[PDB]
Amino acid sequence: IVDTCSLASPASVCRTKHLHLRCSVDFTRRTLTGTAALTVQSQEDNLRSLVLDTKDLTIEKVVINGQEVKYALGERQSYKGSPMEISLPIALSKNQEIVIEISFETSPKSSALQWLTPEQTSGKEHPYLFSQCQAIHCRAILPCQDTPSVKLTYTAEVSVPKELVALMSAIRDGETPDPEDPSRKIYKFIQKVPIPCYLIALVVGALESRQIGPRTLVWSEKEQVEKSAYEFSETESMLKIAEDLGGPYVWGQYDLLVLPPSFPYGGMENPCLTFVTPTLLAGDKSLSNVIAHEISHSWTGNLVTNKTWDHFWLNEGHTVYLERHICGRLFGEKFRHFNALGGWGELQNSVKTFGETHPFTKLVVDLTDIDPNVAYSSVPYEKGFALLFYLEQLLGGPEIFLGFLKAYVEKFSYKSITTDDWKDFLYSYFKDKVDVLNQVDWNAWLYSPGLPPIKPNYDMTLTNACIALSQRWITAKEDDLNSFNATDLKDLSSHQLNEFLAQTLQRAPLPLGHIKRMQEVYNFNAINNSEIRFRWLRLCIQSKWEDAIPLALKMATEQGRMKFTRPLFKDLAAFDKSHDQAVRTYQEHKASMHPVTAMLVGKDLKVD
Numbered sequence: 001i002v003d004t005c006s007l008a009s010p011a012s013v014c015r016t017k018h019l020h021l022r023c024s025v026d027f028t029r030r031t032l033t034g035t036a037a038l039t040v041q042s043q044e045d046n047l048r049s050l051v052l053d054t055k056d057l058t059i060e061k062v063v064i065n066g067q068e069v070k071y072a073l074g075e076r077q078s079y080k081g082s083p084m085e086i087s088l089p090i091a092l093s094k095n096q097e098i099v100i101e102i103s104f105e106t107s108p109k110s111s112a113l114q115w116l117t118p119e120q121t122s123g124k125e126h127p128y129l130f131s132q133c134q135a136i137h138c139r140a141i142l143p144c145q146d147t148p149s150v151k152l153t154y155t156a157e158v159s160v161p162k163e164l165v166a167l168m169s170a171i172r173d174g175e176t177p178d179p180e181d182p183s184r185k186i187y188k189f190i191q192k193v194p195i196p197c198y199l200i201a202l203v204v205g206a207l208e209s210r211q212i213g214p215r216t217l218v219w220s221e222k223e224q225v226e227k228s229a230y231e232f233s234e235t236e237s238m239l240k241i242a243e244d245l246g247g248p249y250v251w252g253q254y255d256l257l258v259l260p261p262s263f264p265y266g267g268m269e270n271p272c273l274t275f276v277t278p279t280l281l282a283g284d285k286s287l288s289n290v291i292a293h294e295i296s297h298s299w300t301g302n303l304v305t306n307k308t309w310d311h312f313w314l315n316e317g318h319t320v321y322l323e324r325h326i327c328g329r330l331f332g333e334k335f336r337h338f339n340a341l342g343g344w345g346e347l348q349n350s351v352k353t354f355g356e357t358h359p360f361t362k363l364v365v366d367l368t369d370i371d372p373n374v375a376y377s378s379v380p381y382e383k384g385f386a387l388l389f390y391l392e393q394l395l396g397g398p399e400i401f402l403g404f405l406k407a408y409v410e411k412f413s414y415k416s417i418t419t420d421d422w423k424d425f426l427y428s429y430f431k432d433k434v435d436v437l438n439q440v441d442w443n444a445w446l447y448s449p450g451l452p453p454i455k456p457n458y459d460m461t462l463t464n465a466c467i468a469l470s471q472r473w474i475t476a477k478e479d480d481l482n483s484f485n486a487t488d489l490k491d492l493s494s495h496q497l498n499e500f501l502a503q504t505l506q507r508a509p510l511p512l513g514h515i516k517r518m519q520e521v522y523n524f525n526a527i528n529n530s531e532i533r534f535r536w537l538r539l540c541i542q543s544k545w546e547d548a549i550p551l552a553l554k555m556a557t558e559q560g561r562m563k564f565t566r567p568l569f570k571d572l573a574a575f576d577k578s579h580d581q582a583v584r585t586y587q588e589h590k591a592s593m594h595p596v597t598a599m600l601v602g603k604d605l606k607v608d
């Protein structure tokens with residue numbers, strides 16, 4: 001097992017045990033400067049050098065035993081960055097530990113960071129910075145073994161302009177004036193649980209907080225605090241359910257940070273401080289499954305970790321499985337099945353986009369010379385979930401399979417594992433059902449592209465009305481459109497409206513007159529729920545309604561969640577009437593987008 005996405009020495013050669021980060025955030029230069037002190041343990045005899053990952057980092061010096069040591073930056077290897085070899089002053093024996101202090105500065109173009117001007121924030125008076133290290137962007141902040149096969153503790157001291165606040169994926173450990181610059185404050189942090197370095201995270205900005213549970217504050221700019229406190233009020237109830245299913249919550253605090261609209265994901269499971277998109281702020285808590293998902297990562301992902309990114313499905317599939325159990329406990333088993341069946345539809349969509357033979361539709365994926373951001377899709381989420389849901393039904397039901405899940409978390413806590421470790425423990429836990437496990441087509445499920453070889457069984461109770469109404473619209477002729485009316489929606493929840501739109505979008509385009517009628521009688525243009533609005537606008541653009549062009553351009557640019565922004569830009573580029581404007585709009589906005597999102601939209605549009 002080799003991590004083909006890292007250029008650093010592997011864990012079999014040496015292991016980082018601890019990071020002590022002292023840095024300063026310079027908004028004038030858009031740089032982070034400081035020192036990263038790595039406590040490294042040799043795993044072999046006579047160790048005289050080691051290699052760290054870096055990406056667009058300027059290295060000033062490397063200090064061991066109080067003296068500068070020799071180092072060399074190799075040539076850049078595309079998205080992987082540049083390897084940094086350090087010559088150790090004294091050969092190390094196996095299990096010997098030393099401290100290596102590296103003085104470094106980031107580049108303004110760091111792919112881990114987005115620097116925001118005051119005008120890009122809610123308050124309009126202060127700048128803002130946030131990080132996103134998953135999968136392999138931590139090396140664009142600091143030199144490290146940038147592989148999830150290594151887990152380390154960390155402490156940090158971050159100097160910032162005194163008007164602003166710093167937060168990290170760690171427990172807050174005090175603040176003080178910066179003695180080297182009275183215009184600044186130093187914020188301190190401690191992460192005492194070993195983590196993979198992709199879970200290191202930093203935000204700096206004009207942040208305020210409100211308590212919403214016994215172990216949860218929500219953080220945001222002042223303009224969003226009140227709405228966020230209401231939107232995420234289910235958090236503590238979800239944590240209690242998650243603890244019941246996964247075992248103890250070991251991280252102390254579970255805080256939430258609501259980022260500015262360019263944050264690229266629904267959430268990011270940064271330990272002690274989950275990051276979330278403001279597109280969750282629907283006003284009715286209806287997108288709270290994203291919080292259940294990030295909560296669940298506190299066990300599946302953050303405690304039990306994928307050893308390499310080839311095995312990412314271990315993180316995401318088990319987390320989606322726990323996510324849907326949390327929402328099933330809250331709202332019922334029929335709702336769990338409804339969301340499960342919706343996820344199968346999303347798997348169908350991903351497979352249909354990539355193509356049924358595409359290597360990125362395999363559950364286990366070989367990322368040799370593949371940028372993980374390019375490979376990312378809903379496949380590991382939903383093919384992984386589908387495998388676990390299938391096994392649940394094969395092995396005796398959800399109560400039995402949740403017993404496996406808790407035992408799995410306990411077995412591999414604080415470790416990094418592969419698909420074969422998972423499968424071996426599955427066969428160990430279910431030793432009395434090995435004959436049943438040997439009926440599984442393991443090669444198809446784990447290593448073949450396309451849809452899985454067997455579809456699970458799904459309760460249809462909550463889905464039937466969505467399918468029925470979608471089919472009424474698809475089979476309607478012009479003389480049937482008069483029969484549709486706002487009353488068609490009166491018994492549908494927001495989740496069901498979203499699924500009605502998903503069902504109909506799968507058959508797009510529809511005739512333009514149908515889409516116009518849908519707006520006339522359902523007024524979907526008025527809905528601000530981001531998931532509903534996204535699917536409605538995709539349906540309008542794919543059905544060639546020119547009126548929807550400005551709406552789709554607005555949504556694609558006024559937020560930056562990649563799930564929404566990328567498909568909206570792609571749909572607009574595919575519609576001949578909006579193509580030129582889509583490209584011009586991307587070019588005008590690209591410099592102020594998140595660096596990774598800008599790169600991907602450019603690839604999607606075939607723009608340079």
Ligand SMILES: CCCCC/C=C\C\C=C/C=C/C=C/[C@@H]1O[C@H]1CCCC(=O)O
Pocket residue numbers: 134135264265266267268269293309310312313363365372373375376377379380561562563
């Ligand atoms: C199995 C294919 C391997 C390729 C992917 C490898 C590494 C993934 C890189 C970045 C992942 C960021 C994930 C963020 C949170 O779980 C996502 C919840 C929000 C997603 C959304 O709803 O927009």
Ligand SMILES: [Yb+3]
Pocket residue numbers: 045046093
């Ligand atoms: Yb030796």
Ligand SMILES: [Yb+3]
Pocket residue numbers: 173174
């Ligand atoms: Yb303390």
Ligand SMILES: [Zn+2]
Pocket residue numbers: 293297315316319
């Ligand atoms: Zn996730």
